[PDB]
Amino acid sequence: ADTTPATGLVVQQWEDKFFQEYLHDGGFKALMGTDENAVIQVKEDLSKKAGD
Amino acid sequence: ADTTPATGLVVQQWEDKFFQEYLHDGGFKALMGTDENAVIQVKEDLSKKAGD
């Protein structure tokens, strides 16, 4: 006859890498700016001063 | 009154070249890759480890 490995001795391998879901970022980052006519206004004044 | 070669003395020639049947591969080889954005993902971990 022919020698075969036991059913419980069949090795399964696992990968250390993983996939990530695809997420749409909206594209708003292109509209952010500190200029007066920016579609989205960025006010970073509270990063140096105090207040909520 | 006309000289003709014998029936067994008529030479036939053979060619060592042969035609090959045309087959369409489907273009799947170009889409194969190992990067994240590859349409077909190639895994080669089992080539070095043990497992089915």
Q: Are B50 and A11 in contact, with CB atoms under 8 Å apart? A: yes
The shortest CB-CB distance from A11 to any of B36, B43, B50 is to B50
How far is B38 from B52, CA to CA, in rounded Å? 23
A32 CB-near residues (< 8 Å, 6+ apart): A38, A40, A42
Report how this structure was experimentally obtained.
Answer: cryo-EM
Q: Between the CA of residue B17 and those of A28, B2, B13, B14, B23, what are the distances in Å?
A: 64, 37, 12, 9, 19
How far is B48 from A11, CA to CA, in rounded Å? 13
Q: How far is B49 from chain A (nearest CA, A)?
A: 8
Nearest chain B alpha carbon to A16: B45
Residue A29 tokens, joined: 């980052």
Residue A22 tokens, joined: 């695809």
This PDB structure is determined at a resolution in Å of: 3.2
How far is A23 from A45, CA to CA, in rounded Å? 30
